[PDB]
Amino acid sequence: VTTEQIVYGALPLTTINEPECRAIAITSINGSATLSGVSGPMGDQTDADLLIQLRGWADAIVVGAETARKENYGPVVLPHGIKNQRQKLGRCGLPKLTLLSKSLYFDFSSELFSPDLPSELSPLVITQQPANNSEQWDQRLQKLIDVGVEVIVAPTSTNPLKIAFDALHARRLKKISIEGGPSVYRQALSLGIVDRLHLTIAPNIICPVESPLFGKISDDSFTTRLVLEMLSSSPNGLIFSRYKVIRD
Amino acid sequence: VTTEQIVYGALPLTTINEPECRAIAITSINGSATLSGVSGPMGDQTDADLLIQLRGWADAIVVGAETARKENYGPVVLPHGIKNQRQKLGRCGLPKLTLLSKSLYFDFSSELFSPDLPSELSPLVITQQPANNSEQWDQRLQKLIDVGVEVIVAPTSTNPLKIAFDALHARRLKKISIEGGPSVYRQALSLGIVDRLHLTIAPNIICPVESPLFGKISDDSFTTRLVLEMLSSSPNGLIFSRYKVIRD
Structure with a gap:
């Protein structure tokens, strides 16, 4: 499974020229976007390649x-x-x-x-x-x-x-591509503009959650369901997942 | 990939008769253990089978x-x-x-x-x-x-x-098998008694996080790294992952 597959593969003609918005994010297994205040250290080369x-x-x-x-x-x-x-x-x-x-x-x-x-x-x-x-x-x-x-x-x-x-x-x-800010992910999800999510799940546990993946501005709550489209892992044990975001 | 594989496969003779402790857990992609106060609704049949x-x-x-x-x-x-x-x-x-x-x-x-x-x-x-x-x-x-x-x-x-x-x-x-309580997962991790983790990642987003996967009793913080051993998904898009917990 290549990064090109993850980004481009198993899709309809919506690529051809349809507007699309995707969020790309990294998280600990327990939902922290950061380790020591940053996301980079959780990523490996596969993940950096996928961003590119x-x-x-x-x-x-x-x-x-x-x-x-x-x-x-x-x-x-x-x-x-x-x-x-x-x-x-x-x-x-x-x-x-x-x-x-x-x-x-x-x-x-x-x-x-x-x-x-x-x-x-x-x-x-x-x-x-x-x-x-x-x-x-x-x-x-x-x-x-x-x-x-x-x-x-x-x-x-x-x-x-x-x-x-x-x-x-x-x-x-x-x-x-929305590359984030948890609060940016949050604002985008609640506006309903995110069509797909690329989520990398890093082989680590961070307690307390430093930075909730989708923000801690509880103001307006929501849940949503996802359709898993693509699943893969790197040799460092990072999971790469592509989901379709389901509206209403 | 069968549930029997997930539980028993790609392991050393530590099965043969070695004591082992495993935690088994379900989470939203953003680290909530519960949806509407319970874990069950996030699971599907594959996941229920894996618990069994x-x-x-x-x-x-x-x-x-x-x-x-x-x-x-x-x-x-x-x-x-x-x-x-x-x-x-x-x-x-x-x-x-x-x-x-x-x-x-x-x-x-x-x-x-x-x-x-x-x-x-x-x-x-x-x-x-x-x-x-x-x-x-x-x-x-x-x-x-x-x-x-x-x-x-x-x-x-x-x-x-x-x-x-x-x-x-x-x-x-x-x-x-520790089937949980986030706070139970938390106490076990910080005591360092968890050898492996079975984590199911459910195709949903829950904001705010109702129940942090590994507890919100911030008292004593910690991080740890994992080695991904097994990765799989159900037809409902739930990800099943087995990690080895790395001590010290």
């Missing part, structure tokens, strides 16, 4: 800024082969990285925020007008603007994932 | 009384075939059901507490002398005694799982 494979499938990546930060995200890269398969299929070489940030706090030493970064590598920042004012946020927005980063400010009322989802669709970006 | 298969492997079953209660446990039953395989191999027909109960609250309408229940079906109750006194507990202990149930009272200081573990070993009961 799904990125090769995606038109856009949606991720919470703090997850992007903690996971040392940089400008999106893809293997020479994938980018070429993409471009020949008339697709942009790289998916658009979309960062959800209510604070707008970013590390500007990152290449993601260099003023001369090629535009296709520049992240789309999605934020919200803060309800009660923050001069930090104002100053941060300005800094982003001054380096040339595109920032969409959602209204105070609105849902930032819905906004991102629309901004990306309105941009003809149809395949969306 | 592991019971056929076991000399004793250790389970928290409240889990036994919520899951409508009765006297242990095994298929005619398994019991015969057991007895011919010189084993007691049925494993000893061992119930961990600090309150000693039981439903005496259960056949488990009928005074004429055959002794091999009678549960071993493991409790603790309550630190500050409870006349309820006294009265309940007496009721159990009056129906003929064997009750071991651990000291106030001691660990009830350690006590159960010893009581069962001292009884020549070498293969122990």
Whole structure:
């Protein structure tokens, strides 16, 4: 079972050109997304490859800024082969990285925020007008603007994932990978926009659960059932699973 | 992949006669042991069969009384075939059901507490002398005694799982299945007595996590790594996994 199978195989013609949103996530067997505050250490090479494979499938990546930060995200890269398969299929070489940030706090030493970064590598920042004012946020927005980063400010009322989802669709970006933030997974599930889930289950137990896989913002509860479509494991004993998310 | 494989296959001669303790558990993909307060509804027939298969492997079953209660446990039953395989191999027909109960609250309408229940079906109750006194507990202990149930009272200081573990070993009961209670799983892991884990991952998401798989008694934290030994799924998309628990 290859990563290409996991991402592309045993599917209908919905690939052909149908919009699709997928969430990709890693968890301990008991539902923690993090070990020592990060997800990376739980993953192995197979898992890292699968993320890249799904990125090769995606038109856009949606991720919470703090997850992007903690996971040392940089400008999106893809293997020479994938980018070429993409471009020949008339697709942009790289998916658009979309960062959800209510604070707008970013590390500007990152290449993601260099003023001369090629535009296709520049992240789309999605934020919200803060309800009660923050001069930090104002100053941060300005800094982003001054380096040339595109920032969409959602209204105070609105849902930032819905906004991102629309901004990306309105941009003809149809395949969306949500690489997380538990709270991002959570907002997406409860909006019902996740069609499939790639979940890696790492051979570890973490007590207490550092970071509940789908968030601890109990606010609005929900359950849902899944259809297992693909099941596999790495030689390090990580389980890779693809589920279809069942609506209503 | 059969349930008999999952339980018995790809192992060393440690089966031959080596003491072994295994925990068996079900979880949502995000680490809840319960849906609507119970585990049963998450399981399918394959999973129920696997529990029975592991019971056929076991000399004793250790389970928290409240889990036994919520899951409508009765006297242990095994298929005619398994019991015969057991007895011919010189084993007691049925494993000893061992119930961990600090309150000693039981439903005496259960056949488990009928005074004429055959002794091999009678549960071993493991409790603790309550630190500050409870006349309820006294009265309940007496009721159990009056129906003929064997009750071991651990000291106030001691660990009830350690006590159960010893009581069962001292009884020549070498293969122990812990069918749970998250807090029972938790106490067992932190005592380091779990050699292997059978974990079923059910195709559902439950937010908030109703019942953290390995307990929410944060008191003493821990992590551990696992070696995946067996991986399989049912036609309903439940994942069955067997891991070896790695000590120190």
